[PDB]
């Protein structure tokens, strides 16, 4: 028994040495001569005033105009950002909701939470209403994230330390990803939707392969739980947000950490992470009731988004990069620009 | 300056707003009770006399109760316990006969200490049930309570032993100026537990409404 336990330890030490010989220079030295972005002032442009409880998730449509939000009052609401109008209001069977997704084609939305079930809703019906298209069951822990690949596939992340890839037309798990040791709290699909990353409560992140269902790489370094994760727009790096009040930038090809986004004035954890269209600004939401803007390439702090009266729980940036939306534990969303 | 189609959209949005407000009032007249307990608390029992999450809706004397049971959640409590910040009260069940099994009472005491002084339930009243009192008063004359509480001083009689256990549980409430604990020795397997929950909930409701507008 200990022979395998010893071999696993020395093999782990070999990896740590192998990826140390590749760290000849840091990102700070390389980007030590470029001009800083300066100071970023973002004014609030809209405020969405429909929910009656805490808002837990949101997602943008690929047309950069519609978005869906979920709150614990049991409603999904689809907003029109430009006019602030409400397009749809969907009543959920269970009000314990913690995730939300919008299909890339725009025909469906997804939802899930403490009921261990992911529900697919059909938006474009001949009868004029919104119907539950499918209910996916099989997870033994709460649903914490879900993301569409296309109209027939979806990846879900659960609190039973597993991720799964479904088939909506049939309702079965095509593949199961079983590597983690704690609850999996976040999820992010690559730009080409060929592979994805997940962050769990064992203070590690893993890089999965959708086609073969195996773990490629494991990234460590955080001292506590991981709550948020996001790919760089290039598709060759990603960022994580943790409860130790620190964001980190990992690199797939170099296979270790690059930057740490921390300061002595922040002591609260991160709830959400997102990039800008160019990959130059990193936006992070905190429990301080406000969002921070980081110069992702120099680790400076460039601005603040302080307009909320409670914790900021979700955060997203449009596909054309024109705006940022933040939901919070008060019942308001805000569009910043 | 709006179009002809651009105004029917606003009318639809206003009707959606109206229905949202109307639905937010039917759900504000119900009492939400989170139902905690030890490992062998007896959640099924608490259901009988009175996947993931399990709900239960009933009605007593024109009052509507929703009772959430979270015994099936095997995950980490600190990730989903903030979802229940805002319930009217918490029902905590303790078996009085679990002072000899293995020690087992100390786990209940630790769980009560964790829940009572949690940072989310800082102003949520707790209704404490002490079940199985018949077994407690039958066993107490064959196994001294000093097994679970060495520092006991009283005698092997149910009347003072039960009071000592109740005091030990109530002493774990640190902030005795914002939270109240209602204790009930549930037994007789009849409609005396629903009545106690009703009384405690009306008291909680009155004090909450008073606390909103100063007064407290």
């Amino acid at each position, epitope marked *: 028994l200990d022979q395998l336990r010893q071999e696993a330890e020395q093999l782990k030490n070999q990896i740590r040495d192998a990826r140390k010989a590749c760290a000849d220079a840091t990102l700070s030295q390389i980007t030590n001569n470029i001009d800083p972005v300066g100071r970023i002032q973002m004014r609030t442009r809209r405020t969405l005033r429909g929910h009656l409880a805490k808002i837990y998730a949101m997602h943008w449509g690929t047309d950069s105009r*519609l978005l869906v939000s979920a709150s614990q009052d049991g409603k999904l609401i689809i907003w029109d950002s430009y006019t602030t*109008n409400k*397009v749809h209001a969907i009543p959920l069977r269970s009000s314990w909701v913690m995730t939300c997704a919008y299909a890339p084609s725009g025909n469906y939305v997804a939802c899930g939470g403490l009921d261990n079930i992911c529900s697919i809703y059909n938006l474009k019906t*001949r*009868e004029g209403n919104v119907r539950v298209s499918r209910e996916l069951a099989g997870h033994t822990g709460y649903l914490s994230c879900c993301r569409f690949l296309d109209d027939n596939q979806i990846v879900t992340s659960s609190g039973d330390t597993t991720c799964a890839l479904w088939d909506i037309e049939t309702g079965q798990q095509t593949t199961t990803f079983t590597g983690h040791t704690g609850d999996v709290m976040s999820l992010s699909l690559a730009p080409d939707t060929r592979l994805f990353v997940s962050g769990a409560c064992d203070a590690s992140a893993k890089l999965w392969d959708v086609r073969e269902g195996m773990c490629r790489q494991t990234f460590t370094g955080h001292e506590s739980d991981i709550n948020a994760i996001c790919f760089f727009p290039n598709g060759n790096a990603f960022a994580t947000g943790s409860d130790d009040a620190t964001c980190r930038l990992f690199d797939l090809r170099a296979d270790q950490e690059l930057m740490t986004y921390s300061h002595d004035n922040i002591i609260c954890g991160i709830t959400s992470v997102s990039f800008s269209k160019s990959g130059r600004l990193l936006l992070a939401g905190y429990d301080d009731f406000n969002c921070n803007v980081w110069d992702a390439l120099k680790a400076d702090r460039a601005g603040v988004l302080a307009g909320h009266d409670n914790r900021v729980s979700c955060l997203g940036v449009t596909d054309d990069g024109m705006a940022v939306a933040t939901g919070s534990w008060d019942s308001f969303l805000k569009i910043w620009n | 300056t709006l*179009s002809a189609e651009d105004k*029917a959209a606003v*009318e*639809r949005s206003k*009707m959606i707003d109206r229905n949202l407000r109307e639905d937010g009032e039917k759900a504000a007249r119900e009492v939400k009770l989170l139902l905690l307990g030890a490992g062998e608390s007896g959640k099924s029992t608490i259901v009988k006399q009175m996947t993931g999450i399990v709900e239960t809706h009933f009605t007593f004397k024109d009052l509507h109760f929703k009772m959430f049971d979270v015994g099936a959640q095997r995950s980490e409590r600190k990730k989903w316990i903030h979802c229940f910040e805002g319930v009217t009260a918490i029902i905590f069940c303790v078996a009085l006969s679990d002072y000899d099994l293995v020690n087992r009472m100390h786990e209940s005491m630790k769980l009560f200490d964790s829940i009572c002084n949690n940072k989310w339930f800082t102003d949520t009243s707790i209704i404490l049930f002490l079940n199985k009192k018949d077994l407690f008063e039958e066993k107490i004359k064959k196994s001294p309570l000093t097994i679970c509480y060495p520092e006991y001083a009283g005698s092997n009689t149910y009347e003072e032993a039960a009071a000592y256990i109740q005091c030990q549980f109530e002493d774990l409430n640190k902030r005795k100026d914002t939270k109240e604990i209602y204790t009930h020795f549930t037994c007789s397997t009849d409609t005396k537990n629903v009545q106690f929950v009703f009384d405690a909930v009306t008291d909680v409701i009155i004090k909450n409404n008073l606390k909103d507008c100063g007064l407290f």
Partner: single-chain antibody
């Protein structure tokens, strides 16, 4: 199965009164606004009235305002048109049309089946200069419609609609807002054009495409139609 069935027509004396009904079945009737559209015995379509969802908004044409009254009964899924003092110019066939308005919706998408009424004896002008064209199957033809005012609004939308009425049938939506293709319509139909000049293009024309094509504007009330272009042969 989204059918709208309607009845109440017949022969009525001039100066009389009548009531028409439209009983819906197979869709969320409460969420759709409803229209009445009138089509004279050998003429083009003509808008009549409109009632919103929730009955909070009602419009009438100038020809019928003060005489007609539109109402709905949501629990029973029924649409009414109470009409009094009928002239000899009201003999026509009346259609029941549903339409729902939100961002990206498709108004005027389903039409009723028609009940015939016979009675014993500024507005935007939409122009369709051509009256009839002979068409050979397998070819391509274009139909033009012209407006007296710019249909392009400040928000970027051009409110032009194209309908097709096959012989002895109800009109069917083809294109909404000048570019979008209605669901269930083959891809060989396409629409284009700028303000005050529009065109409908059909490629590889074949059977079941003969009929009359109408262009309607939805920029402001009252809604107005074109005279219609007929494809034969």
């Amino acid at each position: 199965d989204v059918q709208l069935v309607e009845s109440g027509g017949g022969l009525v004396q001039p100066g009389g009164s009548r009531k028409l009904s439209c009983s819906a079945s197979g869709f969320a009737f409460s969420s759709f606004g409803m229209h009445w559209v009138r089509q004279a015995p050998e003429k083009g379509l003509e808008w009549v009235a409109y009632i919103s969802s929730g009955s909070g908004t009602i419009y009438y044409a100038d020809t019928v305002k003060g005489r007609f009254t539109i109402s709905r009964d949501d629990p029973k899924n029924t649409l009414f048109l109470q009409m009094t003092s009928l002239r000899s110019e009201d003999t026509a066939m009346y259609y029941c049309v549903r339409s729902i308005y939100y961002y990206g919706s498709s108004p005027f998408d389903f039409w009723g089946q028609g009940t015939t009424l016979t009675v014993s004896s500024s507005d935007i002008v939409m122009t369709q200069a051509t009256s009839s064209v002979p068409v050979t199957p397998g070819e391509s033809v274009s139909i033009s419609c012209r407006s007296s005012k710019s249909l392009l609004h400040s928000n970027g939308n051009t409110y032009l609609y194209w309908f097709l009425q096959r012989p002895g049938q109800s009109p069917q939506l083809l294109i909404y807002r000048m570019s979008n293709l209605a669901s269930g319509v083959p891809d060989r139909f396409s629409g284009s054009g700028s303000g005050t000049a529009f065109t409908l293009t059909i490629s590889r024309l074949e059977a079941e495409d003969v009929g009359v094509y109408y262009c309607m504007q939805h920029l402001e009330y009252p809604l107005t139609f074109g005279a219609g272009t007929k494809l034969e042969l």
